[PDB]
Design an enzyme around this catalytic site. Structure first.
Site, PDB file in Angstrom:
ATOM      1  N   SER A   1       0.817  -1.206   0.000  1.00 49.20           N
ATOM      2  CA  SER A   1       0.000   0.000   0.000  1.00 49.20           C
ATOM      3  C   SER A   1       0.861   1.270   0.000  1.00 49.20           C
ATOM      4  O   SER A   1       1.612   1.508  -0.962  1.00 49.20           O
ATOM      5  CB  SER A   1      -1.010  -0.005   1.102  1.00 49.20           C
ATOM      6  OG  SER A   1      -2.181   0.686   0.662  1.00 49.20           O
TER       7      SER A   1
ATOM      8  N   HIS B   1      -7.210  -6.384   1.665  1.00 51.91           N
ATOM      9  CA  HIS B   1      -6.152  -5.405   1.520  1.00 51.91           C
ATOM     10  C   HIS B   1      -4.882  -5.810   2.281  1.00 51.91           C
ATOM     11  O   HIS B   1      -3.783  -5.451   1.862  1.00 51.91           O
ATOM     12  CB  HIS B   1      -6.702  -4.012   1.817  1.00 51.91           C
ATOM     13  CG  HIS B   1      -5.671  -2.939   1.667  1.00 51.91           C
ATOM     14  ND1 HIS B   1      -5.120  -2.603   0.445  1.00 51.91           N
ATOM     15  CD2 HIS B   1      -5.066  -2.150   2.585  1.00 51.91           C
ATOM     16  CE1 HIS B   1      -4.235  -1.639   0.612  1.00 51.91           C
ATOM     17  NE2 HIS B   1      -4.188  -1.338   1.911  1.00 51.91           N
TER      18      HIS B   1
END
Length: 261
Positions: A86, A243
């Site tokens: 990320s 995620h």
């Protein structure tokens, strides 16, 4: 440029630098580095405003990239493998485009090079988390079970809750404190959610994008810009992961990483 805190697992092999995402640290990569250290010299880096690393007001990708560049200098590493999750993935992409000659291969975990807008669940979820954190007073010194029940009202997902709560530490007075620079984070949310621009395309570095099946940080409209920056990039979807795909499906994370590097 700040001096980043790091830990090194593994004495032989090519260097492998791992960069966590927002609110994370090298500690979240312990279990993956446990496998990877048999083949590489793994560096678990705490990025600026995170873990044990120094605090600053600016958290732009430019500055975080520079932190990375300085770290690589101060350790005398010629060329490196990189995994960036990320926020850590954007830093890595920034760094790689600016310095492709220092990167052997790049792994980007569940984030795209482009900007996320306010309608996106990325921006929305971050907006929530900030509000939550800004609104907890650690100085009130209530035990870490209390902070937990306070965050119980804000966000439901317990993994997210404890993920965030790894950022609360004990202080010298005995009172609790955030170890992360929540203020800098808040006043850099636009910087953090912004797209990669102003880079010499194409980047001639092999790259791997690992997408979580149950996450929407990478979609099919992302493939065009991914391919523009990294023409020979590979995209791989880890089944049944969101995620935080390396925490949820670590075995498959290691598999895809070892088949690429």
């Amino acid at each position: 440029s700040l001096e980043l805190f790091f830990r090194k697992k593994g004495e032989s092999g090519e260097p492998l630098i791992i960069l966590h995402g927002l609110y994370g640290s090298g500690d979240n990569w312990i279990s993956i580095a446990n496998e990877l250290k048999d083949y590489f010299q793994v560096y678990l880096i705490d990025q600026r405003n995170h873990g044990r690393s120094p605090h600053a007001d600016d958290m732009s990708y430019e500055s975080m990239a520079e932190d990375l560049h300085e770290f690589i200098k101060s350790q005398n590493l010629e060329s490196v493998n990189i995994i960036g999750h990320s926020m850590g993935g954007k830093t890595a992409m920034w760094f790689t485009a600016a310095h492709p000659d220092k990167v052997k291969k790049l792994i980007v975990a569940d984030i795209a090079p482009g900007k996320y807008d306010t309608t996106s669940p990325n921006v929305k979820t971050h907006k929530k988390i900030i509000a939550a954190l800004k609104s907890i007073d650690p100085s009130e010194a209530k035990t870490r079970k209390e902070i937990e029940t306070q965050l119980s009202r804000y966000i439901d997902n317990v993994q997210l809750r404890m993920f965030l709560l790894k950022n609360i530490e004990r202080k010298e007075d005995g009172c609790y404190r955030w170890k992360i620079n929540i203020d800098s984070i808040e006043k850099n949310i636009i910087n953090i959610m912004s797209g990669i621009t102003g880079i010499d395309i194409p980047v001639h570095v092999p790259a791997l994008f690992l997408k979580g099946e149950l996450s929407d940080y990478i979609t099919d409209k992302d493939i065009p810009l991914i391919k523009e920056i990294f023409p020979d990039a590979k995209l791989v979807t880890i089944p049944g992961a969101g995620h935080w795909l390396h925490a949820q499906q670590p075995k498959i994370f290691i598999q895809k990483t070892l088949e690429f590097l």
